[PDB]
Design a binder for this molecule. Structure first.
Ligand code: K
Ligand code: K
Ligand code: K
Ligand code: K
Ligand code: K
Ligand code: K
Ligand code: K
Ligand code: MG
Ligand code: MG
Ligand code: MG
Ligand code: MG
Ligand code: MG
Ligand code: MG
Ligand code: MG
Ligand code: MG
Ligand code: MG
Ligand code: MG
Ligand code: MG
Ligand code: MG
Ligand code: MG
Ligand code: MG
Ligand code: MG
Ligand code: MG
Ligand code: MG
Ligand code: MG
Ligand code: ZN
Lengths: 177, 84, 59, 183, 115, 60
RNA sequence: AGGGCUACACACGUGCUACAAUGGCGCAUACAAAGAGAAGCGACCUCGCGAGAGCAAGCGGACCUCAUAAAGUGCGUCGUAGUCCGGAUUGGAGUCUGCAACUCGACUCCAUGAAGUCGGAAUCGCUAGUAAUCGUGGAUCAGAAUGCCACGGUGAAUACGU
RNA sequence: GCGGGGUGGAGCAGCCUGGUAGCUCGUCGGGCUCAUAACCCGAAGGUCGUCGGUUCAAAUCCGGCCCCCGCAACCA
RNA sequence: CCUCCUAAAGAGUAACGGAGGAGCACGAAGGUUGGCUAAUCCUGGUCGGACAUCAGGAGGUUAGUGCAAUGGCAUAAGCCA
């Protein structure tokens, strides 16, 4: 909760000054952080999805929900209902803790980290990024990485525009470039 | 490459032509056969036509070309490719 | 009409040659015009222009 | 017709004679502009005569069409088929030199060497005009590489060039051309 | 056992292990171990954390991994953009240093492309 | 949170070679030793020609 | 004078280097022959990581120089991996010759680290100081050998028989 | 009117029963040979007549259109 | 045998009239209770591409209904437990 308290004690005031918000309720707030580990190759093997679920669980601190195909698609040879991924949604204290870990430990361990793109904002204030190697999270053990797994991280925010979204994330010392 | 103790190489005729062109500010391309002369810093901004063996290819000297020989910017063999 | 063409086609034989290529003597001579080169390799390489132009001029 | 050609000849002669005096003035007055002016007049007149020459050369009806070149080996046998391959190489390379585009429609190859026959499509300006005179039988005299004794042998191969004629328009029968009888 | 953003082997001797860093070979590895005051024959696993920190400090004095890669990429790009002979050879994927091109050059040209 | 289905999530100490020590909840049981962190990473810290070459090298 | 003879979808011939442990690397330490040298061989010493540079002996030579032979042997390590195998390729920095190394020289240093894990049909050489393997010298030559010519080190297998 | 067909260059499979293209010759490369054939060792080449539909997905199932085949076309 | 039109605004209504389907399926795909809401497109995002999974937006049933067509269906008859 270091980061949540930091929000409530610094970020709120800074953003109030920056955007001249009338009410504190107008300040952008990190609503949730969704980590998704869609595994296409689980069509051939179910244990791949299980191992990826374990990895996402270690990174998130939570048991992941196994997402399955919305509709059958020929191109990837998937039928509707087959599990093609695993997701975790982080809210509250678990979310703020993950944000701290991502900012202060994992992003530093990103190989050749030169700065995260500020163009990635969705157009409504949310921010999605991609991790290529789960090894960037200290929880995963390099001595047991059977396969190079990645994921994508979405920070969904109450901000009404990309400018407010980037201001909030920057105020949290997010390493943009 | 040429030993640093010897200094860079430039054909005296080309050196004189480059000096005269720089001083006079002329914009006519300077034709040369001296593919072996180095591109000096003073050369930047000039159009020098280096002989490719059958014609003088025009080359506008830039700062990144300094140190390279003039012949490196005038290909001598033309290869469209087999079964073009 | 095609058969008439095929019957006007000269036999590929000893009597009739528009051009002779003696490669043991380095001589190529067109019998119609008279153009006679000695650089047989150029004509083999495709320097037929001398013979072709001579024929067109002689029409 | 007579007039046109005669006038062009007379004007060519007289205009060249005129350019002579104009060039004399160019150099004499040392007017570099007038030297370039004389060059301009002469260049155009040169091109004019070249046009007349082009009309003399390519006077055939279909001279402008794309052409087909057929090469067929004759009396030499294996040697003739080798000679045909040589002729094919020669003509293809000449076509490249002239800038025409070539394709091999069909090619019957020899059992031991060379080609029995080959058809080549030549596409280009006045291709049939440039290649029409090459039609004929070509004689080759060399020590045959296919004779054990290395004897001097004569072999023959034929080139036939024919123009690419447009496909005939098919015509349907005018009902006024038919008489129908029922019985 | 993590240096310069990558993990180094731990069961190997240090001199060999450091070579796993892009930009460090045997000579630079000997230099690093010497400046850190660690025997070249000691396995990476058999090192205290302070020794690994000293190794990281020593590696910091060179250009390695992504920094080196982007320098190399920039140089090749500069040649290709200058349009020098070397750059054109780089573009067309042919040998750049004046090697023969009719019989050999498979390393640059890749596997044979049959007609 | 549903009990018995989630990983074990307890507080651990993570120390970077630069010096920063963070007490953070994590799934890993042991304490973490970090080769890098936001406090010391070159990008976070912000710590991360031809004519000159010719002139200097040739001394003409 | 500049370019080309050095090109490059591709096919073949003849070579070099390998695919490792009968080996790789590091340290130490034995044993040759033959040859060349004056616009030459160049010692020593000093500087440079190195290629080399500066100064400078000797030698037209059984005298001086090129010029420590290498394989080997002893110790240590690697422990079987595309590897401490392999060294192609490429980036950067240099040296020397030479008016002049861009096309298109050789060599050095740092980085890089490809194919290749013993090769289908087929095919080659060799009967003894031979094959195999290991070094060395020479001509041509300003510079530019895996080629050629020559010299030694270690040193086999097998030949029933037609 | 009723039946069949149309797939590497050629001849045939694969369709029924949707997921996947095969055989023989031919072509190309390397061998053997003085050379060619034969022979031996390797390669490549068809998005399935043409459109459309249906389907997550079509050589395959459906409908047109084109070509080719058969039959049928009678009392009159 | 079922659906639409012909069929003339109740039912019914013919032709070798114009168009399509059925000869089953499901112990859940039936009952109830509780809950939920689509297609499609846009933007952002590891491999990931026209198309997998994730986030937001636009849209509002243009979806869905085990299978033809018609009439229905949001209180859903559609989806999950
Ligand atoms: K070359
Ligand atoms: K060789
Ligand atoms: K050179
Ligand atoms: K390696
Ligand atoms: K030499
Ligand atoms: K009705
Ligand atoms: K139910
Ligand atoms: Mg070379
Ligand atoms: Mg040569
Ligand atoms: Mg090695
Ligand atoms: Mg010598
Ligand atoms: Mg090296
Ligand atoms: Mg391999
Ligand atoms: Mg092995
Ligand atoms: Mg004998
Ligand atoms: Mg040897
Ligand atoms: Mg020997
Ligand atoms: Mg199919
Ligand atoms: Mg009614
Ligand atoms: Mg009524
Ligand atoms: Mg009635
Ligand atoms: Mg009735
Ligand atoms: Mg139902
Ligand atoms: Mg209900
Ligand atoms: Mg129901
Ligand atoms: Zn730190």
């Amino acid at each position: 909760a270091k980061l949540h308290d930091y929000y409530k004690d610094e970020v709120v005031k800074k953003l109030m000054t920056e955007f001249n918000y009338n009410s504190v309720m107008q300040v952008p707030r990190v609503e949730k952080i969704t980590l998704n580990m869609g595994v296409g190759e689980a069509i051939a093997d179910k244990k791949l999805l299980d191992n990826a679920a374990a990895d996402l669980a270690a990174i998130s601190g939570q048991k992941p929900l196994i997402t399955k195909a919305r509709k059958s698609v020929a191109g990837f040879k998937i039928r509707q209902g087959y599990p093609i991924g695993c997701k975790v949604t982080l809210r509250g204290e678990r979310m703020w803790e993950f944000f701290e870990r991502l900012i202060t430990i994992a992003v530093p361990r990103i190989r050749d980290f030169r700065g995260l793109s500020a163009k990635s904002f969705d157009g409504r204030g949310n921010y999605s990024m991609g991790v290529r190697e789960q090894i960037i999270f200290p929880e995963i053990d390099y001595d047991k990485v059977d396969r190079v797994r990645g994921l994508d991280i979405t920070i969904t925010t109450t901000a009404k525009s990309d400018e407010e979204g980037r201001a909030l994330l920057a105020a949290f010392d997010f390493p943009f470039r | 490459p040429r030993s640093l103790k010897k200094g860079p190489f430039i054909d005296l005729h080309l050196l004189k032509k480059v000096e005269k062109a720089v001083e006079s500010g002329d914009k006519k391309p300077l034709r040369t056969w001296s593919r072996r002369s180095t591109i000096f810093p003073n050369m930047i901004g000039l159009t020098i036509a280096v002989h490719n063996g059958r014609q003088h290819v025009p080359v506008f000297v830039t700062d990144e070309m300094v140190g390279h020989k003039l012949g490196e910017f005038a290909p001598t063999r033309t290869y469209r490719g087999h079964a073009a | 009409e095609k058969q008439a063409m095929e019957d006007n086609k000269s036999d590929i034989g000893w009597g009739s040659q528009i051009r002779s290529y003696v490669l043991d003597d380095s001589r190529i001579k067109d019998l119609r015009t008279g153009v006679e080169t000695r650089n047989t390799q150029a004509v083999l390489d495709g320097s037929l222009d001398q013979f072709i132009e001579a024929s067109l001029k002689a029409g | 017709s007579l007039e046109a050609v005669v006038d062009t000849l007379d004007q060519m002669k007289q205009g060249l004679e005129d350019v002579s005096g104009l060039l004399e003035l160019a150099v004499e007055a040392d007017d570099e502009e007038t030297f370039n002016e004389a060059v301009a007049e002469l260049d155009a007149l040169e091109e004019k005569l070249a046009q007349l020459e082009f009309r003399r050369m390519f006077s055939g009806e279909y001279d402008s069409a794309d052409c087909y070149l057929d090469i067929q080996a004759g009396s030499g046998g294996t040697e003739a088929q080798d000679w045909a391959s040589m002729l094919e190489r020669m003509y293809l390379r000449w076509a490249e030199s002239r800038g025409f585009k070539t394709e091999i429609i069909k090619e019957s190859e020899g059992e031991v060497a060379g080609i029995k026959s080959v058809t080549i499509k030549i596409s280009g300006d006045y291709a049939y005009g440039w290649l029409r005179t090459e039609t004929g039988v070509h004689r080759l005299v060399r020590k045959s590489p296919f004779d054990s004794g290395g004897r001097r042998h004569t072999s023959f191969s034929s080139a036939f060039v024919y123009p690419e004629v447009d496909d005939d328009i098919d015509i349907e029968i005018n009902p006024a051309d038919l008489r129908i009888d029922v019985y | 056992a993590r240096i310069a953003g990558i993990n180094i082997p731990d069961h190997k001797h240090a001199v060999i292990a450091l070579t796993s860093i892009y930009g460090v070979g045997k000579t630079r590895s000997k230099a690093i171990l010497a400046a850190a005051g660690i025997a070249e024959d000691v396995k990476i696993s058999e090192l205290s954390e302070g020794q690994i920190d000293t190794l990281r400090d020593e590696v910091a004095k060179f250009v390695v991994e992504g920094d080196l890669r982007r320098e190399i990429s920039m140089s090749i790009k500069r040649l290709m953009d200058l349009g020098c002979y070397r750059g054109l050879r780089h573009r067309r994927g042919l040998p750049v240093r004046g090697q023969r091109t009719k019989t050999n050059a498979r390393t640059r040209k890749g596997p044979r492309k049959p007609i | 949170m549903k009990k018995d289905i989630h990983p074990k999530y307890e507080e651990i100490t993570a120390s970077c070679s630069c010096g920063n020590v963070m007490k953070i909840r994590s799934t890993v049981g042991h304490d973490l030793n970090l080769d890098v962190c936001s406090k010391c990473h070159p990008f976070f810290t912000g710590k991360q020609g031809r004519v000159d070459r010719f002139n200097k090298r040739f001394n003409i």
